[PDB]
């Protein structure tokens, strides 16, 4: 019968397959069960999940970070979503249009009125010692900014909020009070962005985005309202979770630890090098890629899923020692919090601008606060929390 099956026949070279049984991983699961199945099973670079349809999951920042940069070993097609899923040189040209639209300079041009945003909104409940950070104050601070980028007209605002808050509630017990629900929020969107492109096109705007696309050409052709509908509809469903979770774990780690609160308040220089390495610490985002050929990362096969968590590549120990630490200071943080490659994030300066601009005009009006149950471990903040703040 066989033997050393584990040595190819003829010639016997040890077989260089990565080591281990699939898992039974739900792939929805927190950065903290990423990094520890992860390190229960990972062999050379990856696990295998046997859930669902199955995929595969790289574990280091090399593997990581090689798969986000080789886009025709590692697809994002899917469905059609401008431009996340579109790749090679028209994917290029969605990227050269958008461009002039999130340029760290103009993210700098938009740092005012950020400001402004979230100096009136904190100055509008400071009196009260108490914000559902998120709920409250970081969500429609980060709607606000992403509706001035974009040309979405605030007084839209309220409107576009409770869709957002409907798809974050998704999986919560329905509320019948409720004008948009699990199953029409998504519909909702994408009328609200059919009419925003009528509004337009009978009455263009200098320096709107939808108005500049009306002569925008893709592939030699004038993009279509139907790639122009999808891009607004990215640009509204990318835009705001993960700047907002981004600022919630943010401030919910400094509310817990008072060391940390004290340096981000008594030493502006460092808030830039602390804003990216919480951006590191808290990154949880999984993208996903679709193998094109055998072997691609050296164990997937053709077809397979393919996923790219940020909460195992930020916390590689061989890039960032005592991964699980944060420390404004970490001399070396090559964080992929924003990806990398060709689709790495189109917003990652403005989401930079926000983060740190809310946080400064925070500790200006409320240096000192809490959370109110200091007797709970601060839980990793995602999908739908209350991250209650007192002062
Ligand atoms: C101003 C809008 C905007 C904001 C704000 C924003 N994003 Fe993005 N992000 C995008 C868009 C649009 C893409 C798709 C780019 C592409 O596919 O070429 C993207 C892509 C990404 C990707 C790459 C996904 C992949 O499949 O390769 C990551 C990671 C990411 N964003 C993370 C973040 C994080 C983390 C934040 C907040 C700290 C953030 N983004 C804030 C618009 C935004």
């Given at each position: 019968?066989?033997?050393?099956?584990?040595?190819?026949?003829?010639?016997?070279?040890?077989?260089?397959?990565?080591?281990?049984?699939?898992?039974?991983?739900?792939?929805?699961?927190?950065?903290?069960?990423?990094?520890?199945?992860?390190?229960?099973?990972?062999?050379?670079?990856?696990?295998?999940?046997?859930?669902?349809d199955?995929?595969?999951?790289?574990?280091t920042?090399?593997?990581?970070?090689?798969?986000?940069?080789?886009?025709?070993?590692?697809?994002?097609?899917?469905?059609?979503?401008?431009?996340?899923?579109?790749?090679?040189?028209?994917?290029?040209?969605?990227?050269?249009?958008?461009?002039?639209?999130?340029?760290?300079?103009?993210?700098?041009?938009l740092?005012?009125?950020?400001?402004?945003?979230?100096?009136?909104?904190?100055?509008?409940?400071?009196?009260?010692?108490?914000?559902?950070?998120?709920?409250?104050?970081?969500?429609?601070?980060?709607?606000?900014?992403?509706?001035?980028?974009?040309?979405?007209?605030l007084?839209?605002?309220?409107?576009?909020?409770?869709?957002?808050?409907?798809?974050?509630?998704?999986?919560?017990?329905?509320?019948?009070?409720?004008?948009?629900?699990?199953?029409?929020?998504?519909?909702?969107?994408?009328?609200?962005?059919?009419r925003?492109?009528?509004?337009?096109?009978?009455?263009?705007?200098?320096?709107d985005?939808?108005?500049?696309?009306?002569?925008?050409?893709?592939?030699?052709?004038?993009?279509?309202?139907?790639?122009?509908?999808?891009?607004?509809?990215?640009?509204?469903?990318?835009?705001?979770?993960?700047?907002?979770?981004?600022?919630?774990?943010?401030?919910?780690?400094?509310?817990?630890?008072?060391?940390?609160?004290?340096?981000?308040?008594?030493?502006?220089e460092?808030?830039?090098?602390?804003?990216?390495e919480?951006?590191?610490?808290?990154?949880?985002?999984?993208?996903?890629?679709?193998?094109?050929?055998?072997?691609?990362?050296?164990?997937?096969?053709?077809?397979?899923?393919?996923?790219?968590?940020?909460?195992?590549?930020?916390?590689?120990?061989?890039?960032?020692?005592?991964?699980?630490?944060?420390?404004?200071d970490?001399?070396?943080?090559?964080?992929?919090?924003?990806?990398?490659?060709?689709?790495?994030?189109?917003?990652?300066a403005?989401?930079?601008?926000?983060?740190?601009?809310?946080?400064?005009?925070?500790?200006?009006?409320?240096?000192?606060?809490?959370?109110?149950?200091?007797?709970?471990?601060?839980?990793?903040?995602?999908?739908?929390?209350?991250?209650?703040?007192?002062?």
């Open positions: 019968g066989g033997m050393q099956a584990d040595k190819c026949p003829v010639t016997g070279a040890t077989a260089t397959t990565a080591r281990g049984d699939s898992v039974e991983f739900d792939f929805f699961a927190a950065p903290q069960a990423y990094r520890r199945v992860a390190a229960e099973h990972r062999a050379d670079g990856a696990f295998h999940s046997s859930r669902g199955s995929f595969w999951v790289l574990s920042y090399e593997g990581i970070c090689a798969a986000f940069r080789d886009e025709d070993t590692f697809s994002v097609s899917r469905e059609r979503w401008i431009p996340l899923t579109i790749q090679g040189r028209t994917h290029n040209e969605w990227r050269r249009r958008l461009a002039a639209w999130f340029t760290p300079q103009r993210a700098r041009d740092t005012p009125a950020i400001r402004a945003n979230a100096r009136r909104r904190i100055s509008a409940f400071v009196d009260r010692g108490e914000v559902s950070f998120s709920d409250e104050f970081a969500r429609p601070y980060v709607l606000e900014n992403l509706m001035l980028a974009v040309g979405w007209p007084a839209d605002l309220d409107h576009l909020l409770a869709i957002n808050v409907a798809m974050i509630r998704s999986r919560e017990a329905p509320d019948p009070r409720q004008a948009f629900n699990a199953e029409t929020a998504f519909p909702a969107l994408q009328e609200y962005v059919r925003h492109v009528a509004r337009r096109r009978a009455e263009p705007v200098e320096g985005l939808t108005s500049a696309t009306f002569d925008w050409e893709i592939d030699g052709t004038p993009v279509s309202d139907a790639d122009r509908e999808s891009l607004l509809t990215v640009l509204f469903l990318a835009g705001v979770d993960s700047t907002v979770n981004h600022m919630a774990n943010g401030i919910q780690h400094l509310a817990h630890h008072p060391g940390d609160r004290h340096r981000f308040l008594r030493d502006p460092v808030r830039p090098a602390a804003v990216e919480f951006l590191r610490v808290n990154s949880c985002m999984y993208p996903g890629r679709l193998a094109t050929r055998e072997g691609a990362g050296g164990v997937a096969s053709q077809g397979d899923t393919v996923l790219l968590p940020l909460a195992l590549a930020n916390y590689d120990p061989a890039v960032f020692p005592e991964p699980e630490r944060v420390d404004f970490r001399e070396q943080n090559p964080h992929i919090a924003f990806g990398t490659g060709h689709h790495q994030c189109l917003g990652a403005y989401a930079r601008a926000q983060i740190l601009t809310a946080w400064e005009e925070w500790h200006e009006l409320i240096p000192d606060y809490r959370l109110p149950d200091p007797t709970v471990e601060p839980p990793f903040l995602r999908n739908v929390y209350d991250l209650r703040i007192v002062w």
